[PDB]
């Protein structure tokens, strides 16, 4: 059966001074995705076909910088990653002779150690964001349009968003987080009280580090959860508002950039909602084959 | 018991169009990222295209962009591929290959292959 | 677009074999990403190393990955009948594109 973690992509880190989310998996950083939603916008305009080149040099190697700053942390990772499957394991944990409180204190040490690398390795790339940003606003200045640019391109990209919004199964994703969290926080307080009858701490110390990812996972799941719903709401609202045949080109420049935030971060969410529901299903796994051997 | 079957293999003529078929089962298949490799008769594996866990995203190799198309049908855990215009050098064996549980910078689980051979 | 790997390598049971990967400063040597898979004949490409060193469950402690600058290795300890199969290195290519290589032959000598 299951019983130990194969895949510990769930940790994440966020920057301390320009907060961007930092993801184990590709693109890394939602910010990506925005570039990567340029090129369809670029692809509309004459003027701006110049994008192609900027996208294939600064944005993909910005891409390829992030993946393989992820990659410098694979030793932290794989070193955290023994502590869990230790800590998750009571046969693997009885093999060692440290105590439960001490390899907890060493998995705090480690988690860190690991999130932080997966920052430090990216601090030269996140500093890449701003000025693709930039770059990307000067590149909107040589649209020939002043008072007349059309919004064609602006709401033909909302109309595909509002097709590729219900392919994700935001319903399902919610109410699957519901009756996780709940049965999840009812085991906490089972194991609660149950823990001073039974003479069986290990398998009570692996059910409870078990839970202690678990409401970690739970959280970075809702995080994500209400963002891609935000977006959802947001870009929806834009179909149904006010469509202006025409804007300024400020007008236009803010709404690529609106547009292209909000359905950067649905698809950033979207990845993590996918990896997170794995883990969440791994981690259910588990805590139920510690169950079994906990009562029986 | 995760197993993937390739299909749609066996005499094919030049210069048409080929489309081949991987079942899935045994994982969520909704839920991972996959790929096309193929192995020419005397030469080694090459990697061909990945396509992402909802099928909202395709990549592929320099030396088959253009020719192929990854897809995929979630809801019959089925992955495709499809060849536009069959040369001689295609002859060979496709494998399926499903992105590993450990990352996405490997695959755990290959189908057994089928294969594809072209002649007139 | 290849990695270069050896045609043919071998040893007698019990004793080591090393199996080189040299890639380009775009794929082995940017990432910690490389790949080993074991193929026999008629039987479906296995994964036994993952992430340049880690190997995965069920693949045995003889199996060993490694990387230097832009060639990876893969390192048999121990040699028996059942390791005499192809074995491919694998790398991340950038932009979600991945790269094979050549393929090894190692018989383990009767």
């Known amino acids: 059966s299951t019983n130990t973690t194969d895949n510990i992509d769930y940790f994440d880190i966020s920057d301390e001074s320009n907060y961007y989310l930092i993801s184990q998996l590709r693109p890394h950083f939602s910010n990506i995705y925005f570039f990567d939603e340029f090129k369809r916008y670029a692809s509309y305009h004459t003027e701006i076909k110049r994008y192609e080149d900027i996208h294939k040099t600064k944005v993909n190697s910005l891409l390829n910088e992030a993946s393989r700053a992820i990659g410098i942390c694979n030793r932290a990772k794989n070193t955290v990653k023994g502590l869990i499957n230790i800590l998750e394991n009571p046969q693997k944990f009885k093999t060692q002779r440290e105590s439960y409180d001490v390899k907890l204190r060493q998995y705090e040490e480690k988690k860190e150690a690991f999130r932080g690398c997966l920052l430090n390795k990216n601090r030269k790339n996140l500093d890449q964001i701003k000025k693709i940003n930039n770059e990307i606003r000067d590149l909107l200045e040589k649209l020939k349009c002043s008072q007349d640019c059309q919004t064609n391109v602006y709401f033909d990209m909302i109309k595909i968003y509002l097709v590729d919004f219900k392919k994700m199964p935001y319903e399902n994703y919610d109410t699957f987080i519901k009756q996780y969290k709940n049965s999840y926080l009812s085991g906490v307080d089972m194991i609660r009280k149950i823990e001073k009858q039974i003479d069986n701490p290990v398998t009570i110390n692996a059910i409870k580090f078990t839970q202690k990812e678990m409401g970690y996972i739970i959280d970075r799941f809702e995080y994500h959860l209400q963002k891609v719903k935000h977006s959802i709401d947001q870009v929806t609202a834009l179909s149904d508002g006010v469509k202006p045949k025409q804007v300024t080109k400020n007008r236009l420049k803010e709404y690529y950039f609106n547009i292209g935030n909000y359905y950067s971060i649905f698809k950033f969410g979207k990845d993590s909602l996918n990896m997170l529901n794995k883990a969440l299903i791994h981690k259910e796994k588990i805590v139920h084959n510690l169950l079994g051997e906990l009562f029986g | 018991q995760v197993q993937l079957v390739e299909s749609g293999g066996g005499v094919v003529q030049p210069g048409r169009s080929l489309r081949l078929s991987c079942a899935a089962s045994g994982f969520m298949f909704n839920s991972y990222g996959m790929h096309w490799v193929r192995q020419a008769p005397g030469k080694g594996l090459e990697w061909m295209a990945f396509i992402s866990y909802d099928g909202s995203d395709d990549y592929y190799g320099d030396s088959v962009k253009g020719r192929i198309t990854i897809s995929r049908d979630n809801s019959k855990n089925t992955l495709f591929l499809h060849i536009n215009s069959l040369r001689t050098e295609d002859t060979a064996v496709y494998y399926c290959?499903?992105?590993?549980?450990?990352?996405?910078?490997?695959?755990?689980?290959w189908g057994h292959g089928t294969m594809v051979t072209v002649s007139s | 677009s290849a990695l270069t790997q050896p045609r043919s390598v071998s040893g007698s049971p019990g004793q080591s074999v090393t199996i080189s990967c040299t890639g380009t400063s775009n794929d082995v040597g940017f990432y910690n990403f490389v790949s080993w898979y074991q193929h026999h004949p008629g039987k479906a490409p296995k994964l036994m190393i993952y992430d340049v060193t880690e190997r995965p469950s069920g693949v045995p402690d003889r199996f060993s990955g490694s990387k230097s600058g832009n060639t990876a290795s893969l390192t048999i300890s121990g040699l028996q009948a059942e390791d005499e199969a192809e074995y491919y290195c694998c790398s991340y290519a950038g932009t979600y594109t991945f790269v094979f290589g050549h393929g090894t032959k190692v018989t383990v000598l009767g």
């Open positions: 290959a499903k992105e590993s549980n450990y990352g996405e910078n490997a695959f755990d689980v």
